[PDB]
Design a protein around this ligand. Sequence first.
Ligand code: AH0
Ligand code: AH0
Lengths: 362, 353
Amino acid sequence: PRYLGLMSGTSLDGMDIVLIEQGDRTTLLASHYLPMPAGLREDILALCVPGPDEIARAAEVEQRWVALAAQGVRELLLQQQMSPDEVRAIGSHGQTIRHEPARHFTVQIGNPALLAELTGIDVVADFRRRDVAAGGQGAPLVPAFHQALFGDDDTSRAVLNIGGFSNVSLLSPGKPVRGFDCGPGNVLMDAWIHHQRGEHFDRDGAWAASGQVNHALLASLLADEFFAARGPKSTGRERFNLPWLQEHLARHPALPAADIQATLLELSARSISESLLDAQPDCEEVLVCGGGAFNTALMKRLAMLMPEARVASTDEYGIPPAWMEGMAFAWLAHRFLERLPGNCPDVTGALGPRTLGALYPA
Amino acid sequence: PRYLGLMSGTSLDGMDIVLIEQGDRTTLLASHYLPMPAGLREDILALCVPGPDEIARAAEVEQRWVALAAQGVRELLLQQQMSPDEVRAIGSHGQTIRHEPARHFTVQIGNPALLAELTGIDVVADFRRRDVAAGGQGAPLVPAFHQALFGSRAVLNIGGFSNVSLLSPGKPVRGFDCGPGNVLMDAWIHHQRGEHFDRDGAWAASGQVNHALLASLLADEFFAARGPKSTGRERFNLPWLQEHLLPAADIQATLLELSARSISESLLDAQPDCEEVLVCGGGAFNTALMKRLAMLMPEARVASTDEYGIPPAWMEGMAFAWLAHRFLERLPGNCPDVTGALGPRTLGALYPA
Ligand SMILES: CC(=O)N[C@H]1[C@@H]2OC[C@@H](O2)[C@@H](O)[C@@H]1O[C@H](C)C(=O)O
Ligand SMILES: CC(=O)N[C@H]1[C@@H]2OC[C@@H](O2)[C@@H](O)[C@@H]1O[C@H](C)C(=O)O
């Protein structure tokens, strides 16, 4: 059947919407991006830290988020010349405003009942909670999907997402799927260039490529306890943010802004490489998705730090890097409806396999 | 099949758990009450007003609430000698910590995914949101169930808050919240005398109704409104009463009359031809209130629901088990003429075990 996937990630630039065909395999039929207004982005970010009157504030933010998603679903279907009735379900991640696996909770907002009401399509949502409920991290959730797409018993491969945050799926033949967050992907580089130069992202990693890696700063950033931990682990804005970076910066004389940028690129390269190679030293292929796949300087640094492996963007495997996550969530809606597991216990640390999500019928 | 119903209401004394048999009709098979600890009750109440760090605080409260519910489900099933596999689903209301239909939102907590994980049973939950999403009040939700059981008569719940279902032959089901049931009388006696409720309405029966206070309390805009309407702790609370504010027992007597009058006047305004009023909730055993309801509605027979085969205390739990059955059968759970929603809607969300 046909499934919609709805993802809104860490960057908060806008919503990813995806149409997939799901039978024996997964086929991307269509994709649609809708920018998020500055107001909504800032209001979401304000909910990402503890604050006053959060229940009402989140309820009102969630309305606008859902109205925008429904709008985006309408636009995709019209542009593809198909009616809501031709889609079996929308797999909606919602929007993470808090991720505290160590306190046994994770918060994705996005009122799925309103989403079903506005789209007239069945909604499967809230995928992370049942994994956390089973003792797991609730993240990353793509591994099972990466496994469905790229699982091959000839070669050991890692499927790496570089978004705001980085995460990897380790597909070792004959062994259970493993994986975890590696740490910051684009989140720090975006925040640094936005703070200094007013731009949302560092195009092709060019500002970073114009500076010099500072070894002292790099070592102290890699000293964060998160990078040392192994096995199931997940992270978010709670750990890696701009105040976090500036605390490491305030201990030492003012450094050139482009050099801080260069260092942050290397932090992402090194934290990915070291955590990946620690878990799958026999890695032969690294398949890269998310925005980071088109960061030239990062894709080059990843190639230098993992010489034993072929580092390549996921587009030369038939899957556009930007749409992988949306597709995963459409696929999770299919998995829910078929009563098939969505998590990987050796990824999240959950007690066992679980059916993820909840069903809100149209 | 068999369904569990899980309700935790306004009073926050504890959780109602219900087992029903559902085929052509609804049969109560078993019921189980589990008290809520003082800590959890107070922590829930703290979330019923705006405050700091609510996301994390609610996540942690919800975890204790679910753990207690799972514990109560385990206890019921053991005591009834049946395994989790014999139950098709749990209908869980969760716990209302905010109800703002005018701002198009209502907040019931109670992590249904954790509930399915701990019980090993499928969970249907979050019943109010789809109705609010369709333009409705999201409350009251019992009317459709009251209609399935008792379908001219009014079916009246007196809990912390009062609500009525008006079952007029040949006409669509109507209904609304009438206002405070026991909530204010409980709050007043707990504030003055330290007791959780006014046993049989005896403290109230010992005082004199104050006409002046009564009139000013009935002057609240909510009592004047008609058609679909819902309320909660946001409107009727102890600071609300004290703003309008005499001997303490006289205030109690007045509060009993407020409940009697607001129920009577709103009921009779909507269904003047009412012949039978079937009363559920704790208020059904408040003697002085059940007498005052009989005085104010002479045209109607006012009777507790137990003499219709349904114990007053378990009606709500049964409604929510029934709503789980309705979800799974893809049948509507709201009444558009009750809630004001745009049309009939399948209520709730399914969290498979
Ligand atoms: C709590 C949360 O939303 N985590 C995100 C984040 O974004 C990337 C990474 O960190 C991953 O763990 C997850 O998202 C992707 C879609 C996932 O679950 O696979
Ligand atoms: C928002 C909310 O939880 N309302 C409750 C409350 O308690 C009684 C009454 O006011 C009713 O409107 C509702 O619960 C019952 C179970 C209902 O929806 O029918």
